[PDB]
From Swiss-Prot, chains A, B:
Subcellular location: Cytoplasm; Nucleus; Cytoplasmic granule
Keyword entries, A-Z: Calcium, Chromatin regulator, Citrullination, Cytoplasm, Hydrolase, Immunity, Innate immunity, Metal-binding, Nucleus, Transcription, Transcription regulation
Name of this protein: Protein-arginine deiminase type-4
GO biological process: chromatin organization; chromatin remodeling; innate immune response; nucleosome assembly; post-translational protein modification; protein modification process; stem cell population maintenance
pH dependence: Optimum pH is 6.5-9.0.
Species whose genome carries this gene: Homo sapiens (Human)
Family: Belongs to the protein arginine deiminase family.
Name of encoding gene: PADI4
A Pfam family the protein falls into: PAD_M
EC number: 3.5.3.15
Active-site positions on this chain: D288, H385, D387, C541
InterPro entries (UniProt xref): Cupredoxin, PAD, PAD_C, PAD_central_sf, PAD_N, PAD_N_sf, Prot_Arg_deaminase_cen_dom
List of residues binding Ca(2+) 2: D130, D132, D140, D309
Superkingdom of source: Eukaryota
Function statement: Catalyzes the citrullination/deimination of arginine residues of proteins such as histones, thereby playing a key role in histone code and regulation of stem cell maintenance. Citrullinates histone H1 at 'Arg-54' (to form H1R54ci), histone H3 at 'Arg-2', 'Arg-8', 'Arg-17' and/or 'Arg-26' (to form H3R2ci, H3R8ci, H3R17ci, H3R26ci, respectively) and histone H4 at 'Arg-3' (to form H4R3ci).
Length: 559, 559
C-alpha cells in the first residue's frame, strides 16, 4: 500500500503509531546492521539483509492492534569491522483505523477512486429530494462506518477528524449515529472532530447528497478521515494517517415506454381509466409540464419528478418536458446503452427564429451522462415536441421494441389505394373528399417537406440508436404548414400515443370510413396487432406515466 | 459513411443532390426490380439483386461533381410475373462539399470527434491573448477551408450556412478570408450565410478561441457547415447535408526548472545578471506574482503569462503563483506525464484557520488537465509556498533530474559531525554557537515537527510522481516556528533557489565558517556538483524565468 517515514537512531529510542494495513517506511542509515523485532511486527527488507546501504528498503506492518502503547518494539543492531554493536530502539503502537462504506454497491457495508461497471468500486449517494432524527428517516441515506481498535489510553494523544473539501461541502450532509443524530459535515462546516473512545469501537454516519451531477459538479464527493497526533502541547497537530471513501451522486434516470407502467396520473375523459384497467396498472386523479424519473441506490430507488414518497427537482415549446423522451435500451456499434438514450429535439442550426431547449436543461441531462442525450430535429413542428413525429412500443421479436415514425407517405399510399378501389368519394372528418386531398398539390408539397424533416430524424435515430429498417414502422399521418410555415397535424396525430405497456391509447383519426371502418384506424391495427399491441382510439390530455425503473443498475454501465 | 433518404416512384421522376463522400440511401418498394444507372453513379445493393423486398439495401454514391444539374440518372425497372416493365426515373446532381482544417495537427490543412494521442485526430485552437485585417495578424489563428465543386447554377437553389452551437458562440471567433477579413461567427451570432459561387471554389476562414478550458468549458468547439435547399419559394429551407470539424482549445502549460532557460526578468543585486551570463540566457530588467507559461499549436506556440509578443490571463499566501510549481516529465505506474505535473500546496484538511489556493485557480489548472495538478502540504509554513521545502534540478543520470527537499535532519547531522570534530564553538550568522543550536531542545522539536510536514510531502511526491529515494536529495536546512506556530527558515532557505538551467543561484546560508568555508555551503556543493550543477550563493528577489516549451506536443498526451 502506502505510508509514513520513521527515523531511528542509536542516540535514543523512537515511538510511533502504525495503522494496520498501511506500509510503514523505515530510515536506517541516517544515524553493517541487523533487524530483530517483536512477533507481531513483520519486518521485510529488500536489497532482510545486513549491508548498511541507503538503497536498502525496510518496511514494518503491525499484525494486530497493540493492547497498550509500545507493545511491539524493533531493535536495530549497528555493527561491523571489529566494533561492539550499538543498538537502536523503536517502540510501535498498532491501531486499526478503517472508514468503511458500501463500495461494492451490494447494499452492505464491508487507491481511493470511484470506478464504473460490474467490476468497479465506489459507494453511491442519493440526493435529498424534499419539498415544503432516527431510522424513521435515515433509510434513504447511505451508511458509513468508522471502525477503530486502539489502546485504551490512545485518544489522549491522538484525535480523529472527519472532513470534506471546501469545494464539495455545499453538496453533501453527514449525520453521526449516537449509539439521535446530528450534523457533522455539511454546507456550513468542512471538518469535524470525533469523540472516539479507546479500545474496540465503531460509530455510524449517515450521508446524503444535496445536488445532482451538473455542469459544475462531476458528481463525486470524497469523505476523508485523518489521524492527528497531539502529544506535544507546544507544536501544532501532525497528520499521522489519512484514508477515505468516494461516493458518487446517483443520476436522475428517465424511463422509456418499453418499461412496464406502474401508475398513471390524470388531471381535471374516462377512456384512459378504461385503458388503464386492461393495462393492469393503477390509476389516480388529481399536467404535461413534468416528467417522472427515478434515482437508484443499492439500498433504495426512489421515484423523482422533474418540473419547471416522491422526490422533486426544478432545473431550467422545445423548452418543455413534452419535448423530452428516452429510447429503449439499445446497443450501438458495440457501445452499450442499458438505460436507453435521452431524446430531445431542437433545430438543425441556430437562427434568429430558432427555438431550442434551455441550455441549463440540456447541460443537466448530459451531466447525468448515463443516458447520453441525443438532439433531434423538431423545430419544424409548430409545437416542436419530438412526440409529434415518433413513439416507441414494446415488441416481442426484434430488439424488444419498434420505433414509430409518422409518415405522410404511408398515408398518401393508403388514401390512394383507397381511391383505386373506388372510394375517392370518402369523407374525412369542412369535410374533404379523399379525392381532393390527393389532387391537392399544395398539401402534397407541405407533406413532402415534413417527410424531409422526419427522414432526417429517421437517419439520426438510425445512427445514434443503432437502428435498422427492421426496427421501424411508419404510421400513416398527414401534416399541414400553418403559422410561419410550421407544421401541425392534418388530423389527430396518432404517433403521439399513450403507451401503457402493450395497450396503446392512440388519438382518433376521424378518417375515411370505408366498410364501416376508418381506413386509417384499420391501417394502424394491421401494423401493430401482429406485434401484440392492443390498439384503442381515444377522442382527444394531461397524463403522466410513472414506469418501472430498470433492473440494470446504472452504475454497472460504462459511460 | 452516413446520408439521406431518396424515394423513387413509377409515378414521376425524382431529382436529388448527392454530396461526394456521403452514403445516400434509396427506398424502392414504396411505389421484381432492376437497377440501371449512369457511369458516374455507383449503385451497390445487398440482400445488386432483383427481389422486390423492403429488406433489400440500395445505395448511391456519386463519383464526380456533376457539371450541371441532373448529369447522372438512375432508372428503376419495375416488373415481374408477365407484366410489361414500368420505369422509375431519378436525376442526381453531385456536389463536393468539404469543410477542412488541420485535423492531423501537422500544421497543414488537408465520425467528427476530437481524439488525443499520436494516433488521434482534431484541429487545435489558440486563445486570443491580448491586453490594452490580414496575414499581418492572422498567423496566430487556425485556418479552416471550405471547398466546393458544384454545377455553375447550383447556388440559385441551395445555400451554405456556417454555424456554432449557441453554447459555444461566446468562446470562438471566425473570420472569412476574401480572396481583407470580416467576422462571420462569434459571441454575437451563431450562424452565417455564405456567398459561394458555383463551379470549383474554396474560401478561407481564420479561427481563434476566446476562452481556455475551464470548470464550465470542456474545451471543444464545433463548427458545422450546412447545405440548405431553397428551391421551393413556399416551403422553408430543408437541410440536405451537414459536416463539421471539431477544434480543441490549447491548454495553458507550465514549464519546469528542468527546461532550458530562455530569458530571465528582474525588477527594481547584480549577482543574478552575472549568473544569467554563465547560463547562456538573456537577461532583461523592468514581481513574483505571475507565472510565464505557454500555449502551443502546430502552427505556433506563444508564451503566455498568468497573473492576478506575450499573451496574458487573469484567473483567481497559498493563493499566490509563488505557491505554484511543476514536476519534470515523469511516468507513474505506467501512466505518462510528458509535460510534468503541476504542484501547488495547501493544508491537510479544512479548518477555521486553514489557507488554500483560491478554488477558481485550482479548478482552472485541472481543467487544462494536461499537467494533472497535485495538492501538497504547505500550510505549515508561515508564507506557505511549496518552494520553501522543495526544488527541482537537472540531472544527467537517473530520470534526468533530482528532487531537492529541505532537511532539518541533514543539518543536525552536519552540525553534529562538526562538533565531534571540535568546532562546537563555530558561530552562525544574535550569533549562536553550533553547540547551543544542538543543545537547544525547543529548536529541536520545532524542526522535528517540520521534518514531519516535509516527510509527509516526500511520501506524497513519491506516490504522485513515481519517485524513488534515488531521485531525492535532502539539503541541510533548519526552520523555526514563529507566528501561530507557523514555520520560517532558521537561516536563508537554500531549497528556494533560482534554477537557471544547470547553474543554481542558491540563497547564502551565512553558516558556521569551518576552515575558511561555510560548512553548509560546503555541504550543498558536495551533494550537487557530482551532478554537474554549478552552485553559487547570492545574498538575498523579484525574478521570473521564461523557459523553453516542451518538444512533446501536449495533444499527443493521453490524459
Amino acid at each position: 500500500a502506502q505510508g509514513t517515514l520513521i527515523r531511528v537512531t542509536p542516540e535514543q529510542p523512537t515511538h510511533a503509531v502504525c495503522v494496520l494495513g498501511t506500509l510503514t517506511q523505515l530510515d536506517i542509515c541516517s544515524s553493517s546492521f541487523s533487524i530483530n523485532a517483536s512477533p507481531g511486527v513483520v519486518v521485510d527488507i529488500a536489497h532482510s539483509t545486513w549491508p548498511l546501504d541507503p538503497g536498502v528498503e525496510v518496511t514494518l506492518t503491525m499484525k494486530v492492534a497493540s493492547g497498550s502503547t509500545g507493545d511491539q518494539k524493533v531493535q536495530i543492531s549497528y555493527y561491523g569491522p571489529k566494533t561492539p554493536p550499538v543498538k537502536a530502539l523503536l517502540y510501535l503502537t498498532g491501531v486499526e483505523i478503517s472508514l468503511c462504506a458500501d463500495i461494492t454497491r451490494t447494499g452492505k457495508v464491508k487507491q481511493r477512486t470511484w470506478t464504473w461497471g460490474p467490476c468497479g468500486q465506489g459507494a453511491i449517494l442519493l440526493v435529498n429530494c424534499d419539498r415544503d432524527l432516527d431510522s424513521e428517516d435515515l433509510q434513504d441515506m447511505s451508511l458509513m462506518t468508522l471502525s477503530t481498535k486502539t489502546p485504551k489510553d490512545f485518544f489522549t494523544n491522538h484525535t480523529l477528524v472527519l472532513h470534506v473539501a471546501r469545494s464539495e461541502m455545499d453538496k453533501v450532509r453527514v449525520f453521526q449515529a449516537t449509539r439521535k443524530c446530528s450534523v457533522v459535515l455539511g454546507p456550513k462546516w468542512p471538518s469535524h472532530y470525533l469523540m472516539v473512545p479507546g479500545g474496540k469501537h465503531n460509530m455510524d454516519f449517515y450521508v446524503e447528497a444535496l445536488a445532482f451531477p451538473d455542469t459544475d459538479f462531476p458528481g463525486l464527493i470524497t469523505l476523508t478521515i485523518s489521524l492527528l497526533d497531539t502529544s506535544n502541547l507546544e507544536l501544532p497537530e501532525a497528520v499521522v494517517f489519512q484514508d477515505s471513501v468516494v461516493f458518487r451522486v446517483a443520476p436522475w434516470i428517465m424511463t422509456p415506454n418499453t418499461q412496464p407502467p406502474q401508475e398513471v396520473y390524470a388531471c381535471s375523459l374516462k377512456s384512459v381509466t378504461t385503458l388503464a384497467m386492461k393495462a393492469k396498472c393503477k390509476l389516480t386523479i388529481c399536467q404535461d409540464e413534468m416528467e417522472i424519473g427515478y434515482i437508484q441506490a443499492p439500498h433504495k430507488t426512489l421515484p423523482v419528478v422533474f418540473d419547471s414518497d416522491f422526490g422533486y427537482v426544478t432545473r431550467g415549446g422545445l423548452d418543455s418536458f413534452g419535448n423530452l423522451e428516452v429510447s429503449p435500451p439499445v446497443t450501438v456499434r458495440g457501445k452499450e446503452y442499458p438505460l436507453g438514450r435521452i431524446l430531445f429535439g431542437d433545430s438543425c442550426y441556430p437562427s434568429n427564429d430558432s427555438r431550442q431547449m434551455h441550455q441549463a436543461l440540456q447541460d443537466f441531462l448530459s451531466a447525468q451522462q448515463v443516458q447520453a442525450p441525443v438532439k433531434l430535429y423538431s423545430d419544424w413542428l409548430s409545437v416542436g415536441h419530438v412526440d409529434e413525429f415518433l413513439s416507441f412500443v414494446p415488441a416481442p421479436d426484434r430488439k424488444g421494441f419498434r420505433l414509430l415514425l409518422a409518415s405522410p407517405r404511408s398515408c398518401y399510399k393508403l388514401f390512394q389505394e383507397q381511391q383505386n378501389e373506388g372510394h375517392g368519394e370518402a369523407l374525412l372528418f369542412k369535410q374533404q373528399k379523399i379525392k381532393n386531398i390527393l389532387s391537392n398539390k399544395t398539401l402534397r408539397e407541405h407533406n413532402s417537406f415534413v417527410e424531409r424533416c422526419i427522414d432526417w430524424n429517421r437517419e439520426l435515430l438510425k445512427r445514434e440508436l443503432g437502428l435498422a429498417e427492421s426496427d421501424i414502422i411508419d404510421i400513416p399521418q398527414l401534416f399541414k404548414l400553418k403559422e410561419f410555415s410550421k407544421a401541425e397535424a392534418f388530423f389527430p396525430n396518432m404517433v403521439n400515443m399513450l403507451v401503457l405497456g402493450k395497450h396503446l391509447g392512440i388519438p382518433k383519426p376521424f378518417g375515411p370510413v370505408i366498410n364501416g371502418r376508418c381506413c386509417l384506424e384499420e391501417k394502424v391495427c394491421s401494423l401493430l396487432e401482429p406485434l401484440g399491441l392492443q390498439c384503442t382510439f381515444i377522442n382527444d390530455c394531461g397524463t403522466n406515466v410513472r414506469r418501472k425503473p430498470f433492473s440494470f443498475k446504472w452504475w454497472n454501465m460504462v459511460p
